[PDB]
Design an enzyme around this catalytic site. Structure first.
Site, PDB file in Angstrom:
ATOM      1  N   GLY A 263       8.226  -1.847  -7.783  1.00  0.00           N
ATOM      2  CA  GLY A 263       7.101  -2.479  -7.112  1.00  0.00           C
ATOM      3  C   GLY A 263       6.523  -1.564  -6.058  1.00  0.00           C
ATOM      4  CD  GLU A 266      -1.038  -3.207  -0.175  1.00  0.00           C
ATOM      5  OE1 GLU A 266      -1.663  -4.288  -0.094  1.00  0.00           O
ATOM      6  OE2 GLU A 266      -0.728  -2.675  -1.266  1.00  0.00           O
ATOM      7  CG  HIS A 299      -4.876   2.444  -3.241  1.00  0.00           C
ATOM      8  ND1 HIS A 299      -6.130   1.987  -3.593  1.00  0.00           N
ATOM      9  CD2 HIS A 299      -4.032   1.387  -3.181  1.00  0.00           C
ATOM     10  CE1 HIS A 299      -6.009   0.676  -3.732  1.00  0.00           C
ATOM     11  NE2 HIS A 299      -4.768   0.270  -3.484  1.00  0.00           N
ATOM     12  CD  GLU A 300      -0.380   1.463  -2.560  1.00  0.00           C
ATOM     13  OE1 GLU A 300      -0.925   1.517  -3.687  1.00  0.00           O
ATOM     14  OE2 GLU A 300      -0.062   0.387  -2.005  1.00  0.00           O
TER      15      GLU A 300
END
Ligand SMILES: *[C@@H]1O[C@H](CO)[C@@H](O[C@@H]2O[C@H](CO)[C@@H](O)[C@H](O)[C@H]2NC(C)=O)[C@H](O)[C@H]1NC(C)=O
Ligand SMILES: *[C@@H]1O[C@H](CO)[C@@H](O[C@@H]2O[C@H](CO)[C@@H](O)[C@H](O)[C@H]2NC(C)=O)[C@H](O)[C@H]1NC(C)=O
Ligand SMILES: *[C@@H]1O[C@H](CO)[C@@H](O[C@@H]2O[C@H](CO)[C@@H](O)[C@H](O)[C@H]2NC(C)=O)[C@H](O)[C@H]1NC(C)=O
Ligand SMILES: *[C@@H]1O[C@H](CO)[C@@H](O[C@@H]2O[C@H](CO)[C@@H](O)[C@H](O)[C@H]2NC(C)=O)[C@H](O)[C@H]1NC(C)=O
Ligand SMILES: *[C@@H]1O[C@H](CO)[C@@H](O[C@@H]2O[C@H](CO)[C@@H](O)[C@H](O)[C@H]2NC(C)=O)[C@H](O)[C@H]1NC(C)=O
Ligand code: NAG
Ligand code: NAG
Ligand code: NAG
Ligand code: NAG
Ligand code: NAG
Ligand code: NAG
Ligand code: NAG
Ligand code: NAG
Ligand code: NAG
Ligand code: NAG
Ligand code: NAG
Ligand code: ZN
Ligand code: ZN
EC number: 3.4.11.3
Lengths: 848, 860
Positions: A263, A266, A299-300
């Site tokens: 999994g 963020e 992105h995170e």
């Protein structure tokens, strides 16, 4: 019995601080919890309604007086019946001791196992609470709007390194031997971003502005992490400076979880990633691998501000933060890692979003959520990419400095707060003065699809008309319209079309006009007869008078309109006739994509010769470039991306130089036992060519089952699946489904590759039909995997017989199975293919 | 105007006696001018002559009477629905009186290959040549000339044809008078015929050469295109031999002065038994002792026997109606095998009879099966009678009747039936009545109607208890219930007791249950000797095991026919579930000592059906496990095979089977040995000898390479040997290149490099193996309208395509899909016999898998 009966929780009780202690035994899959929830009532209530699932509560106590639990599994809620009427503004503390099981479904507080380089069984635990799994780990008010502080305490054995969001406060050895790790109090945050890891890891740390950034991986894999840490620092300095709001926490941990069904989230200070997504090797890992790891960290990271610091009041606005991160994914990259050419990827990502958006099966981005399953429906990459697209249309319209201003203003005005999408639009509305209202962004969000802008040039005025882009209603958008024109004068301006019809007065009479500069606006443009021919002509004379982004837009836009009939297919091929003078990768790949779509659709119908005329035509246009290509890695990222494309096209269609060069390269690598290095940008090509002989196939299979490198393993799988031996192909899908030689995760990718070519075409859809129940058992309905399985197997069906068959199969399952997103989308695609063929097949014979 | 006849059949009132037909066919224009002179007689009183006529454009229609030179004008009536034309007579047709009806007409020579058809072909000299022939069976004569088109209405025929000097014109009777006309044309007239049926009249206008031989009084002759008259030596030699046998056996000499056989130069050409003018497609008669194989030699011998036995069984003694078509067609099929064992004993055609019978038994044990004798009323019902099932079951009933009674008692009743009903129209029951003259009426042939009037056949369960043999009877039906099902079963049984005391006998189970009193205790019992009886025999556990054990001791204590019957039966019952599949494979574990062809091919057949079924599903380890187990038994037999054409026809066929299996699966040598042979043949530019037995096996091995496939594709389009061309095609369709396989089907449908006729053989070959299994069924679905345009709905081809593409499906998902497709076509098409049977077959496969698939892992 239970008192409250509603999906969402009452607004009466509010959590302030969370005191969570967990004793998880990793060998066994059990954990003992202790949650001290410090709340405050706002309304006079006699009961506390909050979430709790897989918990066997020991003692529940209100504060000292032991209270009682009430159950409601339908909403996943619990109730505490208070001895006294909870008064307004009064703080109250509520303790819950519980027994629970560490998850296997890789959701919530999950656990798994792996084998070391020393071949020793090692345990690992982690978290993934988005959107509703926090309640499985600990009783809590599992809603984003319920922000609070977190004091997390994890008891663990010596060997294991325990992690969490905040930095570790104290690690104390208990009398049983086990260490009790205590973590610093968290900042005001939602239940879903709460994280904790238990695993035998090693680190790679680099300090920045007092905030210590580290990459946590398994000791055997701490050599590949080096690029990720270097990248994180760069982007953290970029984001902290762009957003003008410093990163809150004193630490930033990124973690490569040692599992393939990991999994990746963020988490505020504990950024989770699937091991593979961070392992870069400057000597082997290709341009696809440099761009991928770089995209993911970015992105995170953008999520730390847009998703953690400034959180959404509810899931119906998830498209905003996932769209904002995906835009910073491509934005930050073109600023700091400019050489990567990540715009090309966004441009292709945008093109695909548009085709899935053009469908009647499409859905608007802003849609109210109330149902339990409706929350998981918000997790599609379609909303994320359309959301990211309309932020690009916005950023290009108003200045790059005007956009940033509203970004900094929104994050400041909403730091540690919960918002509704409209609050970003309001933050924008302060343009220095309030120019245009944000009813514009509401036209895009609130309605499905996107528009078709029809241009007609008459002298010094260009007649503009908008309409719903539909394949086959009163749809109206507020569209910004960028446009470049040509005594060699290069002029560009912007205009807002808010009405169904309009016009743009030009300063001088121009020869050519190209509406939508670099496709920055989420729309398809259709010029009138002589205006299409104007650009078509110019492209043939000098195409560089336009950008690669502008060029690829005309290629995609002509080939989309050709399907819908606004342009005949002969005009689509008349535009691409200029390709002989194209050197930039973006338009070349869009052409090759478009042409490969027509090729396979045709081939599946059995027009093998007509289909080959299409490819000899395209080869005759890319012949110089294909011949100029070097079988190496020496070049700029975009230029080695072109190398892979051109050599994959020529070797797929066995075109001159190609196959023999790849076959020579394959035989050498094989003789050397796969020890002699092959350039990575020619790897897949050389492999695909080699698998077309039993000896090479048997060899590649033997290397796939042995080798370490997952990136090389993927290139071998794609090759083994590109074979023409239907027996070999069937066995792959059989062996992957059972998890014999290939994990069930790579199965979707196999089925997609098998059914892409003539030998395995019918075979792949037969496999999806015959193993439907096993597929649905292994991958749930609505699953990303089951959605690409149905799309992959059915998309190339272009007959009424095939449509009737697909429809009949999906009805014979369930009425709930026939009335699905992926099913009704697939059936809409076959119908469109049937249509594209009736419109465009006739003519073909006579001109290809 | 109002037609006086609403009925289908013509009235009994007017009966023809003689016909005088004059024709002038223009083969280059494919049009003909005709003239008929029907001599009729009135048995009842009428004002209207009701007969048949289609495609005719009638100019003049005139009527005469008894003692009147003068021709009275009469008006014609039209009714296209029943193919009927009524003649409104000026005089009342008084019973007993004879009148002469004359009709002159214009018509077109057939575009197709039915009635009076025409075609063109190329020469060995690149020249175009025109040809005409006939195919009247069943309702076509009425298209060529107005007549009383019913087999009951029998008359004499005087046929006269005007032709060009270069064409050789033929007909039923020998030529009486050829007279050169003033224009440079010849008027050929043939002697008045015997009392014969309208569908048996024939005439050929073609540029042919001959080959003749006068057996006693009869001049037998074989007619062919000048360029291929050399290949008809075997054809005549065989025809002369069989004509001596039939005449002698039937004890009625052939009534015509000549016996003409013709090899029509068209692939679609109407092949039939017309009295004295036996037509056959060129392909079926051409034979060369060197280049030709075993199947080739058998085919031509069987096809000559069949059309020949028909001169007595069908021409001399015809049936009143088309509902008894199975009687003569099953009799010709019975003489097809009988005569061949009598004369051509070396062919071992009893092996081909057994197989045919095995394959008949399978199709007949389906619910879609219908009894052989059922009321025929319309043209659709007339065409329904033209299926090989009624012929083959009929052939099996005659074998069982011949074996029950004596071979000498069967001959008496046969001769009796013909002599008594020569030149007469017959009802099916007259054959059984002639047999009922058994020395007198010892037994009734009410036994035969238990077989003709019911669908399927019985399952006979046998239980040995000391010296008592307990018999039971039930309909052999496959699961998925009326008790009118009872047969008069002739029970043949063979045993062995004290010191190998081999005893045999017969008993007649005319009841549900029975008991046979055995002489003494026996070590084993075997019911239905040589499978003469049309049924299946099940046994009690110990009695099945006794036979299984005996096959391991000395299996030759039994005939090869008995040995193959047991391999069929055990495996059939294993389907029904009366015997576990474990027992079937235990029986065949005797195969290590099997040297006879018949049991080996049958073991292979049953085993190749399981393999193909397991393989179409994912079970590819089970499929290989099955084939390596079979190979283990047959190892020596495979290893002893020489790559030649040496040996008896039987042991030649065996080589073809054993080596075809061994290469198909790639087991040891086979492949390399075949590939060596392929390369050498390819090296000589295909101008080298391949032994015909190992030929297809060799072709298939090479076809597995792009080099081989392409070399073969080139040889297909170039070469002339249609037998070798077919061996190349099977190989091209045996390929594993999905793209090559599709291309073949697409081509044959567009008539590109392969003619449309071979499409069904292609579709079936593609579909049989994994690479093209889904590809052949998809092709049938996508190209269904062109398929049904080309081959009509209900034709043998369309049934063949539907069966071939579907038979290997054994999943419910596949069963729903097949149904759905046909349901979406039409409920008129979804209610066809072949679609219902196709779905029935899948249903039975799903059931076979649910019964035997699970335990299979643990064995083989
Ligand atoms: C509810 O609990 C919070 C716990 O933090 C109390 O807040 C603290 O109040 C003191 C003054 O009384 C401050 O010095 C702290 O800085 C506060 N902390 C935070 C984070 O707010 C709050 O006062 C309590 N309210 C009631 C009604 O007792
Ligand atoms: C999980 O429970 C087991 C109980 O057996 C603990 O296992 C011990 O682990 C240590 C290493 O830390 C070993 O030296 C001991 O031999 C193990 N004990 C036994 C009896 O086998 C384990 O430490 C527990 N882990 C946590 C996180 O509580
Ligand atoms: C793993 O993380 C720790 C910090 O948690 C790093 O420790 C620092 O190491 C440097 C030298 O490399 C020292 O100057 C610091 O004083 C250390 N800080 C602490 C808090 O111990 C450690 O270096 C990291 N591991 C690696 C291999 O980089
Ligand atoms: C069919 O009709 C044609 C045309 O009247 C006849 O054609 C003649 O054929 C011979 C060779 O058989 C040629 O030598 C003549 O020159 C042809 N004449 C014409 C005008 O084409 C043909 O003979 C007729 N056949 C019959 C059987 O009547
Ligand atoms: C069958 O072929 C023979 C070949 O000889 C033909 O016989 C010749 O017929 C002519 C008259 O047409 C006689 O003058 C010759 O003497 C015969 N030849 C011999 C060797 O006797 C015969 O006519 C052919 N019959 C048919 C109908 O084709
Ligand atoms: C934990 O797992 C066991 C089975 O191992 C199960 O019986 C039990 O119900 C689970 N606990 C909870 C709280 O569901
Ligand atoms: C709940 O936890 C207690 C802890 O003492 C345990 O004894 C009990 O068995 C658990 N309840 C169930 C139903 O498993
Ligand atoms: C465009 O020109 C038209 C006249 O042709 C005029 O009505 C309109 O106001 C002009 N608009 C602008 C912005 O130039
Ligand atoms: C493509 O060619 C044009 C020619 O004018 C040039 O400007 C451009 O730089 C070339 N691109 C590359 C990548 O070399
Ligand atoms: C080299 O080949 C051997 C077999 O000959 C194989 O066992 C070995 O794993 C291969 N080398 C590597 C580095 O994998
Ligand atoms: C068939 O014959 C009729 C006359 O009976 C004629 O009118 C018709 O045109 C012919 N058919 C063809 C295909 O020419
Ligand atoms: C044949 O064809 C048409 C009828 O279809 C007719 O006009 C013609 O005269 C008929 N021919 C004769 C000779 O009666
Ligand atoms: C002709 O008519 C008479 C009666 O008028 C009949 O008995 C006789 O059978 C008929 N002639 C022939 C040859 O059949
Ligand atoms: C068989 O033997 C029994 C004596 O056990 C006798 O009664 C019976 O009639 C015999 N039946 C036949 C058919 O031989
Ligand atoms: C077959 O069986 C045995 C040899 O196993 C032998 O006695 C018999 O004669 C063989 N038959 C033929 C026809 O060779
Ligand atoms: C192969 O033989 C055929 C005749 O059988 C001929 O047409 C062809 O040209 C030959 N090829 C060569 C290369 O001689
Ligand atoms: Zn995200
Ligand atoms: Zn026949």
């Amino acid at each position: 019995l239970f008192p409250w009966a509603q999906i969402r929780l009452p607004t009466a009780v509010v959590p302030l601080r969370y005191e969570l202690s967990l004793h998880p035994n990793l060998t066994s899959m059990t954990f003992r919890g202790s949650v001290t929830i410090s709340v405050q009532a706002l309304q006079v209530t006699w009961n506390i309604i909050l979430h709790s699932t897989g918990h066997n509560i020991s003692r529940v106590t209100f504060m000292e007086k032991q209270a009682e639990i009430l159950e409601y599994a339908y909403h996943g809620q619990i109730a505490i019946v208070a001895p006294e009427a909870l008064l307004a503004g009064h703080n109250y503390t509520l303790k819950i001791e519980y027994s629970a099981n560490i998850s296997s479904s890789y959701y919530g507080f999950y656990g798994f196992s792996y084998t070391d380089e020393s071949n020793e069984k090692k345990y690992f635990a982690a978290t993934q609470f988005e959107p509703l799994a926090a309640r499985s780990a600990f009783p809590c008010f599992d809603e984003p709007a319920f922000k609070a502080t977190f004091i997390i305490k994890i008891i663990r054995d010596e060997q294991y390194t325990a992690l969490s969001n905040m930095p570790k406060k104290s690690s104390v050895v208990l009398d049983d031997g086990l260490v009790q790790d205590e973590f610093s109090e968290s900042v005001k945050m939602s239940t879903y971003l709460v994280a904790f890891i238990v695993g035998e890891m090693k680190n790679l740390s680099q300090d920045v502005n007092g905030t210590l950034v580290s990459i946590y991986a398994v000791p055997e894999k701490i050599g590949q992490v080096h690029y990720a840490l270097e990248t994180t620092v760069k982007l953290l300095e970029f984001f902290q400076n762009y957003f003008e709001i410093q990163y809150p926490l004193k630490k930033l941990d990124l973690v490569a979880i040692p599992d393939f069904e990991a999994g990746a989230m963020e988490n505020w200070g504990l950024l989770t990633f699937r091991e593979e997504t961070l392992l870069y090797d400057s000597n082997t890992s290709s341009m696809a691998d440099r761009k991928l790891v770089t995209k993911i960290i970015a992105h995170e990271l953008a999520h730390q501000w847009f998703g953690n610091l400034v959180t959404m009041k509810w899931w119906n606005d998830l498209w905003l933060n996932e769209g904002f991160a995906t835009f910073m994914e491509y934005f930050s990259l073109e600023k700091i890692f400019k050489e990567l050419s990540s715009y090309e990827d966004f441009l292709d990502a945008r093109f695909k979003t548009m085709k899935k958006d053009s469908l009647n099966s499409s859905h608007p981005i802003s849609s109210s959520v109330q149902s339990s399953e409706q929350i998981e429906e918000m997790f599609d990459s379609l909303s994320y990419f359309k959301g990211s697209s309309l932020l690009l249309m916005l950023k290009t319209y108003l200045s790059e400095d005007v956009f940033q201003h509203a970004v900094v203003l929104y994050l400041h005005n909403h730091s540690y707060a919960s918002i509704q999408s409209d609050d970003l639009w309001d933050s924008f509305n302060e343009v220095n003065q309030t120019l245009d209202v944000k009813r514009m962004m509401k036209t895009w969000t609130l309605q499905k699809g996107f528009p078709l802008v029809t241009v007609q040039k008459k002298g010094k005025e260009l007649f503009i008309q908008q309409e719903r882009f539909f394949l086959n209603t009163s749809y109206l958008w507020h569209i910004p319209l960028s446009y470049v024109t040509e005594n060699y004068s290069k002029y560009q301006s912007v205009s807002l079309l808010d009405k169904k019809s309009g016009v743009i007065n030009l300063t001088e009479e121009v020869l050519w006009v190209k509406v939508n500069i670099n496709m920055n606006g989420y729309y398809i443009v259709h010029y009138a007869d002589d205006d299409w021919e104007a650009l078509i002509h110019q492209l043939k004379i000098n195409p560089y008078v336009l950008s690669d982004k502008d060029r690829a837009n005309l290629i995609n836009n002509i080939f989309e309109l050709a399907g819908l009939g606004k342009v005949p297919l002969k005009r689509a091929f008349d535009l691409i006739n200029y390709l002989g003078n194209e050197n930039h990768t973006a338009p070349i790949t869009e052409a090759l994509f478009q042409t490969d779509l027509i090729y396979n659709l045709l081939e599946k119908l059995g027009y093998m010769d007509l289909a080959s005329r299409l490819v000899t035509r395209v080869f005759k246009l890319l012949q110089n470039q294909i011949q100029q290509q070097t079988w190496t890695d020496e070049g700029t990222p975009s230029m080695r991306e072109l190398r892979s494309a051109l050599l994959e096209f020529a070797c797929t269609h066995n075109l001159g130089n190609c196959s023999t060069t790849a076959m020579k390269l394959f035989d050498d690598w094989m003789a050397s036992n796969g020890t002699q290095s092959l350039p990575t940008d020619v790897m897949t090509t050389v492999f695909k060519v080699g698998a077309k002989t039993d000896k090479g196939w048997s060899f590649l299979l033997g290397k796939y089952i042995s080798i370490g490198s997952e990136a090389e393993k993927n290139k071998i799988l794609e090759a083994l699946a590109s074979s023409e031996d239907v027996r070999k192909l069937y066995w792959l899908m059989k062996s992957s489904l059972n998890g014999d030689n290939f994990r069930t995760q790579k199965l979707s990718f196999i089925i997609r590759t098998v059914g892409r070519h003539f030998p395995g075409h019918l075979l792949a859809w037969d496999f999806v039909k015959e193993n439907w129940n096993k597929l649905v058992q292994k991958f749930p309905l609505g699953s990303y995997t089951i959605q690409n399985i149905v799309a992959g197997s059915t998309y190339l069906f272009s007959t009424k017989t095939h449509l009737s068959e697909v429809q009949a199969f999906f009805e014979n399952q369930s009425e709930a199975t026939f009335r699905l997103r992926c099913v009704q989308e697939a059936l809409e695609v076959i119908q469109l293919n049937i249509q594209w063929m009736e419109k465009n097949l006739k003519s073909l014979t006579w001109w290809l």
